[PDB]
Design an enzyme around this catalytic site. Structure first.
Site, PDB file in Angstrom:
ATOM      1  N   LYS B 118       0.855  -1.214   0.000  1.00  0.00           N
ATOM      2  CA  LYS B 118       0.000   0.000   0.000  1.00  0.00           C
ATOM      3  C   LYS B 118       0.881   1.251   0.000  1.00  0.00           C
ATOM      4  O   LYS B 118       0.608   2.155  -0.805  1.00  0.00           O
ATOM      5  CB  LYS B 118      -0.965  -0.006   1.187  1.00  0.00           C
ATOM      6  CG  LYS B 118      -2.195  -0.885   1.006  1.00  0.00           C
ATOM      7  CD  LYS B 118      -3.334  -0.524   1.934  1.00  0.00           C
ATOM      8  CE  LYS B 118      -4.614  -1.267   1.615  1.00  0.00           C
ATOM      9  NZ  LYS B 118      -5.722  -0.861   2.509  1.00  0.00           N
ATOM     10  N   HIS B 189     -18.278   4.176  -5.710  1.00  0.00           N
ATOM     11  CA  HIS B 189     -16.949   3.642  -6.087  1.00  0.00           C
ATOM     12  C   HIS B 189     -16.863   3.683  -7.613  1.00  0.00           C
ATOM     13  O   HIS B 189     -17.631   2.957  -8.264  1.00  0.00           O
ATOM     14  CB  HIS B 189     -16.764   2.246  -5.484  1.00  0.00           C
ATOM     15  CG  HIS B 189     -15.716   1.435  -6.161  1.00  0.00           C
ATOM     16  ND1 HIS B 189     -14.371   1.623  -5.921  1.00  0.00           N
ATOM     17  CD2 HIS B 189     -15.804   0.436  -7.064  1.00  0.00           C
ATOM     18  CE1 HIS B 189     -13.678   0.776  -6.654  1.00  0.00           C
ATOM     19  NE2 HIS B 189     -14.533   0.035  -7.362  1.00  0.00           N
ATOM     20  N   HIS B 216     -19.731  -7.530   1.387  1.00  0.00           N
ATOM     21  CA  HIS B 216     -18.375  -7.147   0.901  1.00  0.00           C
ATOM     22  C   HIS B 216     -18.104  -7.766  -0.475  1.00  0.00           C
ATOM     23  O   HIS B 216     -16.918  -7.945  -0.807  1.00  0.00           O
ATOM     24  CB  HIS B 216     -17.296  -7.491   1.939  1.00  0.00           C
ATOM     25  CG  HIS B 216     -17.688  -7.143   3.334  1.00  0.00           C
ATOM     26  ND1 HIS B 216     -17.894  -5.841   3.742  1.00  0.00           N
ATOM     27  CD2 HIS B 216     -17.919  -7.921   4.413  1.00  0.00           C
ATOM     28  CE1 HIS B 216     -18.235  -5.831   5.017  1.00  0.00           C
ATOM     29  NE2 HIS B 216     -18.255  -7.095   5.453  1.00  0.00           N
ATOM     30  N   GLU B 256      -8.990   2.289  -9.340  1.00  0.00           N
ATOM     31  CA  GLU B 256     -10.214   2.651  -8.577  1.00  0.00           C
ATOM     32  C   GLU B 256     -10.094   4.050  -7.964  1.00  0.00           C
ATOM     33  O   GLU B 256      -8.995   4.389  -7.505  1.00  0.00           O
ATOM     34  CB  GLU B 256     -10.460   1.614  -7.486  1.00  0.00           C
ATOM     35  CG  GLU B 256     -10.380   0.191  -8.000  1.00  0.00           C
ATOM     36  CD  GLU B 256     -10.662  -0.875  -6.957  1.00  0.00           C
ATOM     37  OE1 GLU B 256     -10.544  -2.069  -7.288  1.00  0.00           O
ATOM     38  OE2 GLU B 256     -11.000  -0.505  -5.816  1.00  0.00           O
ATOM     39  N   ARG B 273      -5.853  -7.884 -11.219  1.00  0.00           N
ATOM     40  CA  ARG B 273      -6.634  -9.153 -11.200  1.00  0.00           C
ATOM     41  C   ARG B 273      -7.410  -9.382 -12.501  1.00  0.00           C
ATOM     42  O   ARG B 273      -7.986 -10.479 -12.609  1.00  0.00           O
ATOM     43  CB  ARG B 273      -7.594  -9.190 -10.005  1.00  0.00           C
ATOM     44  CG  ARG B 273      -8.542  -8.003  -9.927  1.00  0.00           C
ATOM     45  CD  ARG B 273      -9.392  -8.000  -8.672  1.00  0.00           C
ATOM     46  NE  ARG B 273      -8.609  -7.913  -7.448  1.00  0.00           N
ATOM     47  CZ  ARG B 273      -8.408  -8.922  -6.606  1.00  0.00           C
ATOM     48  NH1 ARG B 273      -8.943 -10.106  -6.852  1.00  0.00           N
ATOM     49  NH2 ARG B 273      -7.678  -8.741  -5.522  1.00  0.00           N
TER      50      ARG B 273
END
Lengths: 529, 651, 90
Positions: B118, B189, B216, B256, B273
Site C-alpha cells: 500500500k 466507487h 463485501h 479505482e 486481477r
C-alpha cells in the site's frame, strides 16, 4: 399407465456399528479367498503343460472361449470348483473341463471345452458329471451346445465310476441324440485328439468342424493317417468343415451358429431396467459370515431388484417366510426367501404363492437361509408335516423357470421345500458363507449326546462330560468339513460359488438364458388339504 | 519471447471458458488444468488438451505452482493465462514462469510487487499526482497522536463518525470499548480501465460503477457510471492513463477512485486481477479485451488509439450466486436439475461456467453466472436486464435471482442515486415475503397436472398394440353425466380444493371456493423446456412448466409460482408406524439383553431387547422415534411368541 | 488444414502443412525456386507412432464393436438383457 409412485424396500445400514464392521471384514476375507483360488484354477495344468500346449500351435482352452463368444460379451462360467480337492493326491483344476453360457453370433449357447492341459484332457468321474450337468442346462433352456473337443479318453484307474452307469460317460451321447431330435443344435469342434468314445462326439453332432493337423478322430487308437482332418474331411466324410488352425475353426463356428435360423422370443412382459437403490457391497456388512446371527432377507432383496421395488404377499401371515413380486433387469420374478424357522402358516403361505406364479407364468427365485422346521408336540398335532409337504409338492410340479440361491444354511427337509438340487431348479448358486447338510452340525452332536448319555445312563455305566466331547467334537468337525461351500461345489451340487456383490448380475444372466425356452402350463398333483 | 500458438489456462470455471473462447476464435490451441471434481467440468471438455493437477482442495491443485509449470512444460504451452484469483496475483509464480521461459499473460513482477504494497503504490500514485485519500495507519494509539492525526486529515473523520474536534475523545473511547480515516457520505466507487503496451503507450476505456455491495462482494456493475460529466470522464481517465505510464503498466488493469459527491474523487487501489466486471466496458467500447491482452502479452502494440476508442450506450452486469438471501446470503451447494437463461444476442451476453445437470461444490466460489445487457440509455438497459433476469430460471437450489429483481425494481436504483449502504438502508424493501397465489394461478397449476397425466397416457399408448382405442383418450367422459374431479393442491400452508369438470369440448371448468373458471390449454415444447399455453376465463398466457417431486413450478414473464401436491400418508411412511402399535416377541425365548430404561427416547432402528430362541439370537429394534412409556419384561424372563415387549407413549 | 480430412485418394494437404510451417515461409523469404530448394524438409517420411496413439486406436476399435452390439440390440425383443452389454465381465 405406469406412472404410479410406489414404496421401495431397503434401509441404510449403520456403517459405524461394530456389527457391520465385523461382518464386512469377515465376508470380505471369504470373497478374497474365493477370488485367489479361482486365479489358481484359471492356470489349469500349469506352466509346463501350458507351454507344451502352445508349442503345438494350439490355443489355450480359455483363449478359445474368448475368441468364440461375441466381442466384449459376458461369459457365465459354471462349476469353476469342480474337482477341488476331490481326489486325494491328484489336482484337477476345474475338473478338466470348462463349461459356461456365452453369446455366439447374438445367440446364447452352452460351451463345453476340454482342458487338454489338465491330465491331458482325460475324463475323471467329476468331469463326466460336470459335462452332464451342462447338457442338462442346455436342454432345459434350449441352448445350442458347442463342444470344443480336445480329450485323452477315460481315466482307466477309475473306470468303474465313468463307464457303466446311466449317469456315466455313455449318457453324454444319449443327451446329444435327444437334443438333436428336439432341434437344439449340436456343434462339435475337433481341436485336438479324440479317441474311443471321444470320436463319437463329432460323429453325433449335427454339424462338425476339425482342425487340419491337430484334430484326430478314430474309434480305435500315425494318428494323423488313422484320423486327421484330411481323412475325415475328404475320404471318411465325418468332417463337415475343414479348418486351418484354431482361429480359423472358431471363425467357422460363429458362421455355423449364424445359420441356425433361430430368433429368441419372450413369453413374459418386459419393463425398462433400473438399478437397485442401494449398493450391493453393503451385503458384506449386512450378512457377514456368522450363521447364528439373523438378518432381514428384505435387505438382500432391496439390493438386487430393479429400483428396490417389491410387492409383498401376505406380509403379516407366516412372517418367517417372505414372498412377493419384483423385477430383475426387466423380467418379472416371484421371490421366496426364508426369514426364520418354517411354520405351518409359512408353508401354507408359500404354497399359495407358488400357485399364483405358475398361473401367471412368472419365474420363481428362492433364497435359502434355513434353520429347520418348528419342533413341538402341538405343531405335529396340527399337521406341520402335512403343511410342509404341501410346499414340497407345489414346488416340484411348478413348470416356471426356478433359480435357487443359498445365502445361508440349508438343512433337512427345509432344503426340499425351498427348491433344492433334487427339485431341478434351472440354476443353483451358493454364497461363500453357506452351509448345507442333512442337519446342522450342532444338532447331530446334541442328538448323539442324548443317545449315548441314554446309552450309559440306561445301561448303568456312568458316561461323563469329558466322554461327551469325545463324542461331539468328531461329529462337529465332520459336518463343518462336509457342509463347506467348497466341499459342496467340488462335487457338482451347485453351479458355482458367487460373490454376493455379483448376485444381481448372475441372476440377470441366468434368467435371460432360461427364457430361451417357452414356459409350459403347470399341472399339479393332489393338494392334501 | 515467442509468438503464442498454444496457451495453458491456469484456472477453472467461467473465467477459464472465457479465455478459451478468445483463443478458439484466434486459432490458439488451449490447454486446461483440472482437479478430480472438475474432471467433467465445462472448461475441461472445451480445451484441446486437459491435465489432472491432483485432488479437489485448491492448495493441492490450482495453487500448486510446481504442477502448473510441469503441465505447461509437458503440453509444450508457450504461455500461461492465470485468469482471475488463484495464481493471477502471485509474484513468485510469475517469476517462476519467466525463469522457465514460459510467457506469463499478465503484468511485470515489479508492477505486481509495487501495487501489492500500500505504501509503495500510494507513494508512486501521489508522485503521479492522482488525488489521495487521507488516513492514519499508525500502530501507536496515544489519544493525543490519534487526535493530532484527526485534525491533520480534517473533520469529519471515521474511527465512530467524528464530525468535530470536541466529540473526538468520547467517540474514540466508545469505539475502543484504532485507525483514523476521513468520514463523509462517500459511497460511490468509480473505477476506470487502462491498457498499456510493452512500448509504453496507454489508452483509457470508459469508467464503470461498482457502488452496490453485498456481504463485501460487488453485485451490479454499470458502464458508463451514471451522472459522470463528459469532461469529468476525460479527466478521470487521463489521470489513470498518466499513472499507468508512470508505473510502466503492461496488460489490462483497473484503477479505482472514490467520489463522495460533486465529482470529488480520490485513489483507493489498483488491481492487476483482470476483474470479471470487464464485460460491461467491452460492450460499450466494442472491443475484446481478452484478445487485446493476448496480443499485448506476445508483444504487439495497443490495437486502437484514444481517438478511435468511442463510448456507445449503457450496459449492466449482474452476477447470479447460489447464495440464499434469507440466511444472510449464505452460500449453498446442490445439483442444478434445471438451468435456463435469456436467449443470447449481441445486446444480451451470458458468461457462465455451469451447465444444466452440473452440481455446485463447497470447494469453490458458488457464482452460477454473469449476465450482461446493452442498450442506448441506462433506463432502457435496466428494463432489458429485468426482462432477462425473469427469463433466467434455476430449479434444485436457492439463488439471489429474486433479490436482484427486487433491487432493480427499487425506485432509487432507477433514479441512479446509488450508495454502498443501499442494501442496509432498503433492507426491509429488498427482502419481501411470498403473497398468497391468485385462484387463476391455481387453475393453471391444476391444468398442468392434468396435461402431464395426458402425456403419460400417450406414452403408454405408443408401446401398446391397440394404439387407436377410445379408452386411451383422456376425455374423462361418462355416459349421460359429467365427471367432476376433486383435487387438492397446497399453496404455502393453505390447502386449496379445486373441482374440475371435464367438459365434452375438451375444456375444463374449475371451481375454487365460490368462483368458477373456464380453462383450456395445451403443452408445447420449445428447446428442452415444456411450456403451457392456457386460457383462464378468456385471459391467455404462456408459462414454462416443470413438475419435480411433489412441486409444480410455473415460470412466467410476470412471476414464478410454486404449488405443492399433497403426499399420501401410505407413501409418507407415517403409515409404517401405524401398521403395528408395539413390537412383539418374535418367538418364545429367553430375554438376554435389555437396552431401554423405563423412560428413554429412542429412534427407529434403536435396538430395544435381544432374545435367544432355540439357540438363535434375535435383536428387537425400535419401530418408531417415540419415547418408551414402559417395559413389559426384564433380563432372564421368558417371553411368549407375539407378546408385547415395550409400551410407547401416545403422541 | 488439420480439420480438412480426405480419404480415398492421395492429396497435397500434408505437403501444404509442412510448407506453411517452414521457417523461410514463416519469415516471408519466398521465391520461385522455394519448393526445389527446400524439397528435403517439405517432403517428410513417416515416423513410428506413440504408444498413446496405439491405445487410442484400440479404444476406438473396442467402441466400434460396442456400437455394433447396440445396433444389433436395437432389433431384438430382449432389449435389456445383461448379455447385450459390452462389459466383458467374468
Amino acid at each position: 399407465y405406469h406412472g404410479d409412485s410406489v414404496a421401495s424396500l431397503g434401509t441404510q445400514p449403520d456403517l459405524g456399528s461394530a456389527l457391520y464392521q465385523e461382518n464386512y471384514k469377515q465376508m470380505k476375507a471369504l470373497v478374497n479367498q474365493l477370488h485367489e483360488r479361482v486365479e489358481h484354477i484359471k492356470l489349469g495344468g500349469g506352466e509346463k503343460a501350458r507351454a507344451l500346449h502352445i508349442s503345438r500351435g494350439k490355443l489355450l482352452p480359455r483363449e478359445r472361449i474368448d475368441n468364440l463368444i461375441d466381442p466384449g460379451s459376458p461369459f457365465l462360467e459354471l462349476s469353476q470348483f469342480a474337482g477341488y480337492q476331490l481326489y486325494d493326491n491328484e489336482e484337477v483344476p476345474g475338473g478338466g473341463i470348462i463349461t459356461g453360457i456365452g453369446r455366439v453370433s447374438g445367440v446364447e449357447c452352452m460351451i463345453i471345452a476340454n482342458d487338454a492341459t489338465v491330465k491331458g484332457g482325460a475324463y475323471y468321474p467329476v468331469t463326466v458329471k460336470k459335462q452332464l450337468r451342462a447338457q442338462e442346462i442346455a436342454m432345459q433352456n434350449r441352448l445350442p451346445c458347442i463342444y470344443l473337443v480336445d480329450s485323452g479318453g477315460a481315466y482307466l484307474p477309475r473306470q468303474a465310476d465313468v463307464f457303466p452307469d446311466r449317469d456315466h460317460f455313455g449318457r453324454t451321447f444319449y443327451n446329444q441324440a435327444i437334443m438333436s431330435s428336439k432341434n437344439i443344435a449340436q456343434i462339435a469342434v475337433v481341436m485336438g485328439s479324440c479317441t474311443a468314445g471321444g470320436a463319437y462326439v463329432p460323429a453325433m453332432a449335427d454339424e462338425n468342424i476339425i482342425v487340419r493337423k491337430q484334430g484326430t478322430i478314430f474309434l480305435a487308437g500315425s494318428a494323423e493317417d488313422l484320423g486327421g482332418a484330411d481323412l475325415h474331411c475328404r475320404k471318411s466324410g465325418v468332417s463337415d468343415h475343414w479348418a486351418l488352425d484354431d482361429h480359423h475353426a472358431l471363425h467357422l463356428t460363429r458362421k455355423v451358429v449364424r445359420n441356425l435360423n433361430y430368433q429368441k422370443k419372450l413369453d413374459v412382459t418386459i419393463e425398462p431396467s433400473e438399478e437397485p437403490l442401494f449398493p450391493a457391497d453393503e451385503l458384506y456388512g449386512i450378512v457377514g459370515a456368522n450363521l447364528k446371527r439373523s438378518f432381514d432377507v428384505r435387505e438382500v432383496i432391496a439390493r438386487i431388484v430393479d429400483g428396490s421395488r417389491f410387492t409383498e404377499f401376505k406380509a403379516f401371515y407366516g412372517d418367517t417366510l417372505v414372498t412377493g413380486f419384483a423385477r430383475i433387469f426387466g423380467y418379472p420374478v416371484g421371490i421366496v426367501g426364508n426369514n426364520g424357522v418354517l411354520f405351518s402358516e409359512s408353508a401354507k403361505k408359500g404354497t399359495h404363492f407358488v400357485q399364483l406364479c405358475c398361473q401367471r407364468n412368472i419365474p420363481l427365485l428362492f433364497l435359502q437361509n434355513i434353520t429347520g422346521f418348528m419342533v413341538g408336540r402341538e405343531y405335529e398335532a396340527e399337521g406341520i408335516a402335512k403343511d410342509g409337504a404341501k410346499m414340497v409338492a407345489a414346488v416340484a410340479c411348478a413348470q416356471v423357470p426356478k433359480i435357487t440361491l443359498i445365502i445361508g444354511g440349508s438343512y433337512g427337509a427345509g432344503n426340499y421345500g425351498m427348491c433344492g438340487r433334487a427339485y431341478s431348479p434351472r440354476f443353483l448358486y451358493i454364497w461363500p458363507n453357506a452351509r448345507i447338510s442333512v442337519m446342522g452340525g450342532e444338532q447331530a452332536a446334541n442328538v448323539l449326546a442324548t443317545i449315548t448319555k441314554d446309552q450309559r445312563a440306561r445301561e448303568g455305566k456312568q458316561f461323563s462330560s469329558a466322554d461327551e466331547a469325545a463324542l461331539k467334537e468328531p461329529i462337529i468337525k465332520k459336518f463343518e468339513e462336509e457342509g463347506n461351500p467348497y466341499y459342496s461345489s467340488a462335487r457338482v451340487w451347485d453351479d458355482g460359488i458367487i460373490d454376493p456383490a455379483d448376485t444381481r448380475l448372475v441372476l440377470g444372466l441366468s434368467f435371460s438364458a432360461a427364457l430361451n425356452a417357452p414356459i409350459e402350463k403347470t399341472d399339479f398333483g393332489i393338494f392334501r388339504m | 519471447g515467442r509468438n503464442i500458438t498454444k496457451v495453458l489456462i491456469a484456472n477453472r470455471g467461467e473465467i477459464a471458458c472465457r479465455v478459451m473462447r478468445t483463443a478458439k476464435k484466434l486459432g490458439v490451441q488451449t490447454v486446461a488444468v483440472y482437479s478430480e471434481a472438475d474432471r467433467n467440468s465445462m472448461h475441461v471438455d472445451m480445451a484441446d488438451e486437459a491435465y489432472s493437477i491432483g485432488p479437489a482442495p485448491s492448495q493441492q491443485s490450482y495453487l500448486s505452482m510446481e504442477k502448473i509449470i510441469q503441465v505447461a512444460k509437458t503440453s509444450a504451452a508457450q504461455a500461461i493465462h492465470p485468469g482471475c484469483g488463484f495464481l493471477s496475483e502471485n509474484m513468485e509464480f510469475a517469476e517462476l514462469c519467466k525463469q522457465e521461459g514460459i510467457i506469463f499473460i499478465g503484468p511485470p513482477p515489479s508492477a505486481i510487487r509495487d501495487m501489492g504494497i500500500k505504501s509503495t503504490s500510494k507513494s508512486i500514485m501521489a508522485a503521479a499526482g492522482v488525488p489521495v485519500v487521507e488516513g492514519y495507519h499508525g500502530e501507536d494509539q496515544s489519544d493525543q497522536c490519534l487526535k493530532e492525526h484527526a485534525r491533520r486529515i480534517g473533520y469529519p473523520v471515521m474511527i465512530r463518525i467524528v464530525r468535530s474536534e470536541q466529540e473526538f475523545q468520547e467517540q474514540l473511547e466508545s469505539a475502543r470499548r484504532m485507525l483514523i480515516e476521513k468520514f463523509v457520505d462517500t459511497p460511490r466507487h468509480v473505477e476506470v480501465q487502462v491498457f498499456g503496451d510493452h512500448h509504453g503507450n496507454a489508452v483509457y476505456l470508459f469508467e464503470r460503477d461498482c457502488s452496490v455491495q453485498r456481504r463485501h462482494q460487488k453485485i451490479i456493475e454499470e458502464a458508463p457510471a451514471p451522472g459522470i460529466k463528459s469532461e469529468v470522464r476525460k479527466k478521470l481517465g487521463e489521470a489513470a492513463v498518466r499513472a499507468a505510464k508512470a508505473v510502466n503498466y503492461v496488460g489490462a488493469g483497473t484503477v479505482e477512485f472514490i467520489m463522495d459527491s460533486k465529482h470529488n474523487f480520490c485513489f483507493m487501489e489498483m488491481n492487476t486481477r483482470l476483474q470479471v466486471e470487464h464485460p460491461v466496458t467491452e460492450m460499450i467500447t466494442g472491443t475484446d479485451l481478452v484478445e487485446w491482452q493476448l496480443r499485448i502479452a506476445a508483444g504487439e502494440k495497443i490495437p486502437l488509439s484514444q481517438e478511435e476508442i468511442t463510448l456507445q450506450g449503457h450496459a449492466f452486469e449482474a452476477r447470479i450466486y447460489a447464495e440464499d438471501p434469507s440466511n444472510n446470503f449464505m452460500p449453498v451447494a446442490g445439483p442444478l436439475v434445471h438451468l435456463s437463461t435469456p436467449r443470447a444476442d449481441p445486446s444480451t451476453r451470458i458468461e457462465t461456467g455451469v451447465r444444466q445437470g452440473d452440481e455446485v461444490s463447497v470447494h469453490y466460489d458458488p457464482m452460477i453466472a454473469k449476465l450482461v445487457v446493452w442498450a442506448a440509455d441506462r433506463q432502457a438497459a435496466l428494463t432489458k436486464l429485468r426482462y432477462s433476469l425473469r427469463q433466467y430460471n434455476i430449479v434444485g437450489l436457492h439463488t439471489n435471482i429474486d433479490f436482484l429483481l427486487n433491487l432493480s425494481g427499487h425506485p432509487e436504483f432507477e433514479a441512479g442515486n446509488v450508495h454502498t449502504d443501499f442494501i442496509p438502508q432498503h433492507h426491509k424493501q429488498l427482502l419481501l415475503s411470498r403473497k398468497a397465489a391468485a385462484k387463476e394461478s391455481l387453475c393453471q397449476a391444476a391444468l398442468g397436472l392434468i396435461l402431464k397425466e395426458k402425456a403419460m397416457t400417450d406414452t403408454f399408448t405408443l408401446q401398446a398394440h391397440d394404439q387407436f382405442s377410445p379408452f386411451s383418450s383422456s376425455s374423462g367422459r361418462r355416459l349421460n353425466i359429467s365427471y367432476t374431479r376433486n383435487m387438492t393442491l397446497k399453496d404455502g400452508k393453505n390447502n386449496v380444493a379445486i373441482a374440475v369438470t371435464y367438459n365434452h369440448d375438451g375444456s375444463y371448468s374449475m371451481q375454487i371456493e365460490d368462483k368458477t373458471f373456464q380453462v383450456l390449454g395445451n403443452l408445447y415444447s420449445e428447446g428442452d423446456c415444456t411450456y403451457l399455453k392456457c386460457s383462464v376465463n378468456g385471459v391467455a398466457s404462456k408459462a414454462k412448466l416443470i413438475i419435480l417431486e411433489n412441486t409444480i413450478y410455473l415460470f412466467s414473464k410476470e412471476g414464478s409460482i410454486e404449488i405443492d401436491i399433497p403426499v399420501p400418508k401410505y407413501l409418507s411412511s407415517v403409515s409404517s408406524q401405524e401398521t403395528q402399535g408395539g413390537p412383539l416377541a418374535p418367538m418364545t425365548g429367553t430375554i438376554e439383553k435389555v437396552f431401554v430404561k423405563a423412560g428413554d427416547k429412542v429412534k427407529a432402528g434403536d435396538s430395544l431387547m435381544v432374545m435367544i430362541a432355540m439357540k438363535m439370537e434375535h435383536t428387537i429394534k425400535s419401530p418408531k422415534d417415540g419415547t418408551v412409556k414402559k417395559v413389559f419384561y426384564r433380563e432372564g424372563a421368558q417371553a411368549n411368541r407375539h407378546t408385547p415387549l415395550v409400551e410407547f407413549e401416545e403422541e
